[PDB]
C-alpha cells in the first residue's frame, strides 16, 4: 500500500519462529531497537503489529524513533520508546515501471505534525494562502499528495523500497505470541529456576491461596518483585519465595593460641543447612 494508507496486520495466537526470518538474506536493512534478534525465540509478546508500506530509497533512515522528515512528520511517525525490528528491501523488480509507476502516493503539506501511530486519509485541497479553494485547485490551492516517479533507470538511492516494521508491545496481559519452546512438567516445593512466559528467576513455587485473582496474573510487592504468578498451562495461583540467604561468621580464638573455628549461619533455621540453634 501507499505511505499515507499504510496497512496494519494484527498478529496473535502464534508459535512465532523468527529463526527463518533471521536466516533469510533478502533483507538489506535488519535493525532492532531494544531486542536482540537472536533472542526473539524465547520471548513472549501479548500482541504483534506489522505495518507495511513503500517509500523512497533515501527515506529508509527516517523510519526510527526521534527522526524528522517530510514522511517522518506528515506520513508516518514512530514513538520515541519504540521496540521491535525494521525490515526493508529493494523492489525494482516489482515496483518499478519504465514509464513510471504512479500508484504510490505520499503527503506533501499538512496543517501540523501528526501524533505517533495514526493514519491520515482525507485528501482535501491544502490551503497554502488566503484564497478560498472551494474544492477548486489553483493558486494557493496545492494538492497534498504527490506520486513517486519510480523507474528501473533511476539511481540506487532513489529506488523504491518496501518497508515492513514489527513492533512488540508488552503489558500485564496473557501473552499469545510465543516462540518454539517446549513447556516442561511442574515441580514445586523445591528451589527451582522457573520461566513463566519470559518471567525468568529462581525460587520455590509453594502453593498458596493468596486471593481469587479473577482476571489477574501477577502479584507484586513494595519493590519490583513478582510475589505470586498464575500458571499458563493450568489455572492455579503459585507463590514465589526466594532461596535462603544469610552470612558466614567465623568464631575463632587467636591463631596464636590454637587453630580451631566455629561457623555461625545467622537467620538460618539450618535443619537443612555439634549443632546448636
Amino acid at each position, epitope marked *: 500500500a501507499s505511505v499515507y494508507a499504510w496497512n496494519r496486520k494484527r498478529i496473535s495466537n502464534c508459535v512465532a519462529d523468527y529463526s527463518v526470518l533471521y536466516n533469510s538474506a533478502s533483507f538489506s536493512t535488519f535493525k532492532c531497537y531494544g531486542v536482540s534478534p537472536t533472542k526473539l525465540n524465547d520471548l513472549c509478546f501479548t500482541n504483534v503489529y506489522a505495518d507495511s508500506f513503500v517509500i523512497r530509497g533515501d527515506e529508509v533512515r527516517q523510519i526510527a524513533p526521534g527522526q524528522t522528515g517530510k514522511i517522518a512528520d506528515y506520513n508516518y511517525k514512530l514513538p520515541d520508546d519504540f521496540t521491535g525490528c525494521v525490515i526493508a528491501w529493494n523492489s*525494482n*523488480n*516489482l515496483d*518499478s*515501471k*519504465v*514509464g513510471g*509507476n504512479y500508484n504510490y502516493l505520499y503527503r506533501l503539506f499538512r496543517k501540523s505534525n501528526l501524533k505517533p501511530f495514526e493514519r491520515d486519509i482525507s485528501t482535501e485541497i491544502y490551503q497554502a494562502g488566503s484564497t478560498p479553494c472551494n474544492g477548486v485547485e489553483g493558486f494557493n490551492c496545492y494538492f497534498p499528495l504527490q506520486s513517486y516517479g519510480f523507474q*528501473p*533507470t533511476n539511481g540506487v538511492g532513489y529506488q523504491p523500497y518496501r518497508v515492513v516494521v514489527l513492533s512488540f508491545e508488552l503489558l500485564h496481559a496473557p501473552a499469545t505470541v510465543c516462540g518454539p519452546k517446549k513447556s516442561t512438567n511442574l515441580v514445586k516445593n523445591k528451589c527451582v529456576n522457573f520461566n513463566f512466559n519470559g518471567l525468568t528467576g529462581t525460587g520455590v513455587l509453594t502453593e498458596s491461596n493468596k486471593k481469587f485473582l479473577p482476571f489477574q496474573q501477577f502479584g507484586r510487592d513494595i519493590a519490583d518483585t513478582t510475589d505470586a504468578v498464575r500458571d499458563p498451562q493450568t489455572l492455579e495461583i503459585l507463590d514465589i519465595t526466594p532461596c535462603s540467604f544469610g552470612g558466614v561468621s567465623v568464631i575463632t580464638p587467636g591463631t596464636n593460641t590454637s587453630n580451631q573455628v566455629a561457623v555461625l549461619y545467622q537467620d538460618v533455621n539450618c535443619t537443612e543447612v555439634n549443632v546448636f540453634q
Partner: antibody, heavy 123, light 108 residues
C-alpha cells in the same frame, strides 16, 4: 504445479481472424500479469503482448500493433487473444506465459509457461 | 533499440564435463538478465531470474554471473537430463523482453 492450456490453433487463410484462450488453475489469476510469446518454427522466442493484473495497462509488440487485442477474464481464470488480419509470417507457435509481478513492463521475468498451440496461415 | 547477442552457437561435452554459456548485451542492462531452458519437446522453463538469483524448483548446479554488458552461465556437470536450448532475455530497455538466439547443447 500451475497449469496453462491454450486453444484456437488451426488453419486459416491470410487476412482471416481466429480466437485464442488459455486456462489457468494452479494459482491466483486475479493478481498477476500475463503475456503471449511467439516461437517461429525456425527461429527463437519473440514477445507479442501483455496485460496487467487488471485491464488498465496494455502493451503490444511493434510488429503486431493494430492487429491484436489481448483480453482478460478474472472471473473464471482465463485470458484471451484476438488476432485479426493474419499474414503468412504468423504461422508460429504461441505460448501463454505468466509474469512474476503485477505490471506489464517490469524487470520481472516470465516464471511459468505452458505448452503452445500451433497455428498455420496458408491455403 | 537494443541488440542481444549469443557468443556460442553449438557446444558438446560429457556427463562429467563443465561448460560455460555466455551472453553479451550491446547496451548496459544493469544485471537484469534471465535464462530459460527450452526443451524442444515441451514448454520452456526458467532457471535464473536476475543476474545471479536461482529460482526455486531447479537444481543448484546451475550458476549465473555478470553485470552491465557481459554475462555468463555455467553448468557444473551436464547431467543426462540437461540437453536443451538456452536463451538469454533482457528486461531493462524500452523494447520489451528482447530474446537472444538459441544455443544448442548436444553432449557427445
Amino acid at each position: 504445479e500451475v497449469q496453462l492450456v491454450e486453444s484456437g490453433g488451426g488453419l486459416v487463410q491470410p487476412g482471416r481472424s481466429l480466437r485464442l484462450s488459455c486456462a489457468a488453475s494452479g494459482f491466483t489469476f486475479d493478481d498477476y500479469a500475463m503475456h503471449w510469446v511467439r516461437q517461429a518454427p525456425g527461429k527463437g522466442l519473440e514477445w507479442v503482448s501483455g496485460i496487467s493484473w487488471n485491464s488498465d495497462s496494455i502493451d503490444y509488440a511493434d510488429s503486431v500493433k493494430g492487429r491484436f487485442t489481448i483480453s482478460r477474464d478474472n472471473a473464471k481464470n482465463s485470458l484471451y487473444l484476438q488476432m485479426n488480419s493474419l499474414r503468412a509470417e504468423d504461422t508460429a507457435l504461441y505460448y501463454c506465459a505468466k509474469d512474476r509481478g503485477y505490471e506489464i513492463l517490469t524487470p520481472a521475468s516470465f516464471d511459468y509457461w505452458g505448452q503452445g498451440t500451433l497455428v498455420t496461415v496458408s491455403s | 533499440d537494443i541488440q542481444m547477442t549469443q557468443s556460442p552457437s553449438s557446444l558438446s561435452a560429457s556427463v562429467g564435463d563443465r561448460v560455460t554459456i555466455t551472453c553479451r548485451a550491446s547496451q548496459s542492462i544493469s544485471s537484469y538478465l534471465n535464462w530459460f531452458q527450452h526443451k524442444p519437446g515441451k514448454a520452456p522453463k526458467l532457471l535464473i531470474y536476475g543476474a545471479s538469483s536461482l529460482q526455486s524448483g531447479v537444481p543448484s548446479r546451475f550458476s549465473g554471473s555478470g553485470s552491465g554488458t557481459d554475462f555468463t552461465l555455467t553448468i557444473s556437470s551436464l547431467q543426462p537430463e540437461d540437453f536443451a536450448t538456452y536463451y538469454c532475455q533482457q528486461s531493462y530497455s524500452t523494447p520489451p523482453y528482447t530474446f537472444g538466439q538459441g544455443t544448442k547443447l548436444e553432449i557427445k
